[PDB]
C-alpha cells in the first residue's frame, strides 16, 4: 500500500529528487532514522544518496536526491505512506500578516516600503541555460507587482497589511514542489514559535496535480492559516493543478474589465469546480521593479489571487478571530453574481465554474454550492460532495447530462454528512451538488423517510417542534432488475414538505437553530426549453433545490447562488427552500 506518484505532465517532471511521505504519527526521530536507513541501504547497493531536507511540522517525511533505480527499495522502507517525484511550479484596526511565496521583491519601492519584510528564506531551482545570467535584472518583477496588488500605498487593496516574502521562484519564474513544501513548513514553524495573529498565505503559482502539495496545504488550512492560490493560466480544468485543486485553499480565477474570463495569448484563466471565485486579473496596475516609484500593468491568475489575498487581509484586520469557513463564505457572499460571460469556457465546464467576481464587504445564514467530481460510468458509480469541517450539509442534489440518475443521499461518512449522488443503469455518470452552510447555533440532523406506495404516510417533514426543513434528497429505491413502471409523485398537502416519488426514500435535513425561519418557493413552466428557475428574495438564503417531475423530463437541479435551477429536456417545476436567521 506504499504508492509512487509523479506529475501527469511529463515536461514538468524532475526525476532524481523525491519527497518520501511517512505515516501520520511519525516523530522526527523516525523520519531521520528512515532517511538514514535509505542512505545506508543505497550505499550497500553502491549508490550515493543526499538527504536534502527532513520534514517535521507540516508532514512527516524527507527530501532525497537519489537515482530512480532505488525507488523500489525506498517503497519497501518502514513507515512510508507514499513517494512523490519532484516537479516544477510556475509563476502565474488589527495587524494581519500576509506571506508571499514567489520571486524576490524590491522591498524599498515607495508602493510597499515599511510594509514588506524579506524573510531570508530562499529555495529555488537553478536556471535553464548553461550561459544564463540575470545581469542587471534583480529577479524582483513578479513578486513586487503582487506585493503591490496586495498592499501597495496607492494601487493596493489592503493598504494596512504587513507582508513577509519567501523566495520560491527563480529569475525564470520557476520553482519546485519540494521548495514550496519547505516554504510552507517554514510558515507553519514560524506560526508555532510566533503569534496568534491572522495569517494569509498567497501562492501565486501552479504545477501539475501534486498529492503532497495538496496534503501540506490541507494541514496548514486546518492549522488556521488562510491559503489563497492562483487557479492557473492554462485555459484548463484547475483540478489538474496544485495547489489549485486543494479543496481548503481559496482558488481564484481571472476576469477582465468587461467581465470576461482573461485570455493570455492562446491560453487564459483556468476554470471548473476547483475554482472558488474570480477576481480582476487583466491589465492590473502595480509596483514595477524598474524604479522605486514605477508602475506596470500585469495579467494572470496570480494578479487575481493577490486581490483576494488583499480582501481576506482587510476582512481579517476588522474581525481577526474569523475562521477560514467564515472567510470563504463571506468572500462568496459579497462577490458580484452572474456578471461573467460563461461562453468563453468549455460547455461542459460552465455549470461547474462559479459565476462570482470578488468584492469587498460594504447574525447571518451563509450557504455555498459544492459540486463533486463526476462519477464513473459504472452503474453502481457514485459522486461524493463534501463540506468544510465547520459547515452544515443543509441539502443535496444531483445532475447528469443524459439525465439517467437514481437520485441522491445525505449520509454520514466519517462522522460528517456528505452528499452522495448515484449513477443509474445505462447512465454515463453523475455529479453530487451539496449546499454547505454556516448557521449560527445549529443542531441539524437528517431523517430518512421510506418509500410510500400506501395511500397514507406520504408526507415527509420536520415533525419535531422547533426543527425546520432546510433540504430534501430523493433516492430511487427500485432494483435495476425489477419491473420498471413510471414513477408516481407523493401528493401535496402542506407547503413545507419534501416533494418526491412514492417509490423513493426521502432524506430530510431538519435544523434547530435560534432565529431560523425557512420557506418554500415553486415555479413551473409547461414545456420549457433548457431550464426552469425560482430565486429567493433579498435577505433570504437558498438552502435546498429540487426538480419535479423525475428523469422523464429532467436532467437534474442545482443551486446557483440564491437561484434554484432545474435543467429540463426538449410541467417542469423548480422547488426551492429559502432560509434566514434572526
Amino acid at each position, epitope marked *: 500500500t506504499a504508492t509512487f506518484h509523479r506529475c501527469a505532465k511529463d515536461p514538468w517532471r524532475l526525476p532524481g529528487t523525491y519527497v518520501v511521505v511517512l505515516k501520520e504519527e511519525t516523530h522526527l526521530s523516525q523520519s531521520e532514522r528512515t532517511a538514514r536507513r535509505l542512505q545506508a541501504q543505497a550505499a550497500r547497493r553502491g549508490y550515493l544518496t543526499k538527504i536534502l531536507h527532513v520534514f517535521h511540522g507540516l508532514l512527516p517525511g524527507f527530501l532525497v536526491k537519489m537515482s530512480g533505480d532505488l525507488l523500489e527499495l525506498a517503497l519497501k522502507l518502514p513507515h512510508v505512506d507514499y513517494i512523490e517525484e519532484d516537479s516544477s511550479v510556475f509563476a502565474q484596526g488589527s495587524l494581519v500578516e500576509v506571506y508571499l511565496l514567489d520571486t524576490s521583491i524590491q522591498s524599498d519601492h515607495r508602493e510597499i516600503e515599511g510594509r514588506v519584510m524579506v524573510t531570508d528564506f530562499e529555495n529555488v531551482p537553478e536556471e535553464d541555460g548553461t550561459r544564463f545570467h540575470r545581469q542587471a535584472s534583480k529577479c524582483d518583477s513578479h513578486g513586487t507587482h503582487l506585493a503591490g496588488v496586495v498592499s501597495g500605498r496607492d494601487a493596493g487593496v489592503a493598504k494596512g497589511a504587513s507582508m513577509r516574502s519567501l523566495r520560491v521562484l527563480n529569475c525564470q519564474g520557476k520553482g519546485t514542489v519540494s521548495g514550496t513544501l519547505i516554504g510552507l513548513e517554514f510558515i507553519r514553524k514560524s506560526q508555532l514559535v510566533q503569534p496568534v495573529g491572522p495569517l494569509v498565505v498567497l501562492l501565486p503559482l501552479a504545477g501539475g496535480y501534486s498529492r503532497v502539495l495538496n496534503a501540506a496545504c490541507q494541514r496548514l488550512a486546518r492549522a488556521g492559516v488562510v491559503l489563497v492560490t492562483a487557479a492557473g493560466n492554462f485555459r484548463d480544468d484547475a483540478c489538474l493543478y496544485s495547489p489549485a485543486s486543494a479543496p481548503e485553499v481559496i482558488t481564484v480565477g481571472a476576469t477582465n474589465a468587461q467581465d470576461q474570463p482573461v485570455t493570455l495569448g492562446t491560453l487564459g484563466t483556468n476554470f471548473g469546480r476547483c475554482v472558488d471565485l474570480f477576481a480582476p486579473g487583466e491589465d492590473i496596475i502595480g509596483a514595477s521593479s524598474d524604479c522605486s516609484t514605477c508602475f506596470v500593468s500585469q495579467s494572470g491568475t496570480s494578479q487575481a489571487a493577490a486581490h483576494v489575498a488583499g480582501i481576506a487581509a482587510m476582512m481579517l484586520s476588522a474581525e481577526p478571530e474569523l475562521t477560514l469557513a467564515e472567510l470563504r463564505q463571506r468572500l462568496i457572499h459579497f462577490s458580484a453574481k452572474d456578471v461573467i460571460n460563461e461562453a468563453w469556457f468549455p460547455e461542459d465546464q460552465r455549470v461547474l465554474t462559479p459565476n462570482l467576481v470578488a468584492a469587498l464587504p460594504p447574525w447571518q445564514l451563509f450557504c455555498r454550492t459544492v459540486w463533486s467530481a463526476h462519477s464513473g460510468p459504472t452503474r453502481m458509480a457514485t459522486a461524493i460532495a463534501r463540506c468544510a469541517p465547520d459547515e452544515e450539509l443543509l441539502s443535496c442534489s444531483s445532475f447528469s447530462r443524459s439525465g439517467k440518475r437514481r437520485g441522491e443521499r445525505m449520509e454520514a461518512q466519517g462522522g460528517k454528512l456528505v452528499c452522495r449522488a448515484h449513477n443509474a443503469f445505462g447512465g454515463e455518470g453523475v455529479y453530487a451538488i451539496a449546499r454547505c452552510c454556516l448557521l449560527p447555533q445549529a443542531n441539524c440532523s437528517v431523517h*430518512t423517510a421510506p418509500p410510500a*406506495e400506501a395511500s397514507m404516510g406520504t408526507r415527509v*417533514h420536520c415533525h419535531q*417542534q422547533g426543527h425546520v426543513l432546510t433540504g430534501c434528497s430523493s433516492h430511487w*429505491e427500485v432494483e435495476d432488475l425489477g419491473t420498471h413502471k413510471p414513477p408516481v409523485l407523493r401528493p401535496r*398537502g402542506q407547503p413545507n414538505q419534501c416533494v418526491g416519488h412514492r417509490e423513493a426514500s426521502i432524506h430530510a435535513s431538519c435544523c434547530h437553530a435560534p432565529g431560523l425561519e425557512c420557506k418554500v418557493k415553486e415555479h413551473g413552466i409547461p414545456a420549457p426549453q433548457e431550464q426552469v428557475t425560482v430565486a429567493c428574495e433579498e435577505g433570504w438564503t437558498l438552502t435546498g433545490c429540487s426538480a419535479l417531475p423525475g428523469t422523464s423530463h429532467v436532467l437534474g437541479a442545482y443551486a446557483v447562488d440564491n437561484t434554484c435551477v432545474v435543467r429540463s429536456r426538449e410541467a417542469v417545476t423548480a422547488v426551492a427552500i429559502c432560509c434566514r436567521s434572526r
Partner: antibody
Framework: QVQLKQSGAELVRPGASVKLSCKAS????????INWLKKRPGQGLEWIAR????????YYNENFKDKATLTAEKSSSNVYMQLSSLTSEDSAVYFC?????????????????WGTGTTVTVSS | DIVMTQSQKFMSTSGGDRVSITCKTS??????VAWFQQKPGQSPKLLIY???NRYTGVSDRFTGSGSGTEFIFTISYAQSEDLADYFC?????????FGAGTKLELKR
C-alpha cells in the same frame, strides 16, 4: 381476526439459506407494509426490511441488504424473507409485523399486529 | 443511526404504585416513539404510540410522556399480569431502532 401466522422453527448449516414465511389474514394483503425484524437473545430488535405486497417493492436496512431478500405472493397471501450465507450471528428469532398508517405523515403509523416469531438456529 | 438507550431496571415511586423506565435517543425524534410489551414466547404488544397515546384496549394504567430525546414509560398499580419485557422504539428515521428491553420485577 387480523393476524400474521409465521412458519415453524429452523435448523440450517453455516453457509446455507432459509426462507421464512409470514402468512397474513383478516385484512387486505396488498394494502399494508410488512416488516421483518431480528431479535437476538441479549440485544434489542433490529429492523431488517419492509415490503409493500401490492407492488412487491422492498426497502432494506443497509446492514441486511446482502443477507436478506423480501418477496410477496398475493395468491398465497404471504410475505417471505430469504436469508443467505448464514453464520452463527444470524441465529436469532425473526418477527414479521404490519405497519398501520392513520395519517398523511410519514410518522402517522404503528406496528399494530405481529407474528409470534420463528427461531432460526445456524449450526453444524 | 439513532441510538436507543433504555433503563436497566424499573425505578419505583409513590410506594410502588408508579414504576417507570426512561428511553433516550441520540438525536431529536420529536414524538415518534412507541412502547411495546412482550411476554416470553408471545408477539410484541403495542401499548403507547406517538410518545403518549394509548393503542385501543390498552389499560389506562399504562402511560407515556416526553418529547425530543427523553421519553418515560410508566405503569400505575402494576400487577403480576404485567410481568413482561418492555421496549421503546423510534420511528423518526429509518433504519428503525429499538431499546434493549427492561424486565419488570415486582415485590411480594
Amino acid at each position: 381476526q387480523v393476524q400474521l401466522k409465521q412458519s415453524g422453527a429452523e435448523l440450517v448449516r453455516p453457509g446455507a439459506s432459509v426462507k421464512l414465511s409470514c402468512k397474513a389474514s383478516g385484512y387486505i394483503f396488498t394494502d399494508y407494509y410488512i416488516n421483518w425484524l431480528k431479535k437476538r437473545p441479549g440485544q434489542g430488535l433490529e429492523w431488517i426490511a419492509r415490503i409493500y405486497p401490492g407492488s412487491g417493492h422492498t426497502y432494506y436496512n443497509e446492514n441486511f441488504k446482502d443477507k436478506a431478500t423480501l418477496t410477496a405472493e398475493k395468491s398465497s397471501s404471504n410475505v417471505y424473507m430469504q436469508l443467505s450465507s448464514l453464520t452463527s450471528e444470524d441465529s436469532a428469532v425473526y418477527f414479521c409485523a404490519r405497519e398501520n398508517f392513520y395519517g398523511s405523515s410519514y410518522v402517522d403509523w404503528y406496528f399494530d399486529v405481529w407474528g409470534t416469531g420463528t427461531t432460526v438456529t445456524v449450526s453444524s | 443511526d439513532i441510538v436507543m438507550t433504555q433503563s436497566q431496571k424499573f425505578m419505583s415511586t409513590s410506594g410502588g404504585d408508579r414504576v417507570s423506565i426512561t428511553c433516550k435517543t441520540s438525536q431529536n425524534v420529536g414524538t415518534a416513539v412507541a412502547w411495546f410489551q412482550q411476554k416470553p414466547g408471545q408477539s410484541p404488544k403495542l401499548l403507547i404510540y406517538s410518545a403518549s397515546n394509548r393503542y385501543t384496549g390498552v389499560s389506562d394504567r399504562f402511560t407515556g410522556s416526553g418529547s425530543g430525546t427523553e421519553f418515560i414509560f410508566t405503569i400505575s398499580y402494576a400487577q403480576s399480569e404485567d410481568l413482561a419485557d418492555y421496549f421503546c422504539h423510534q420511528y423518526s428515521s429509518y433504519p428503525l431502532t429499538f431499546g434493549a428491553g427492561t424486565k419488570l420485577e415486582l415485590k411480594r
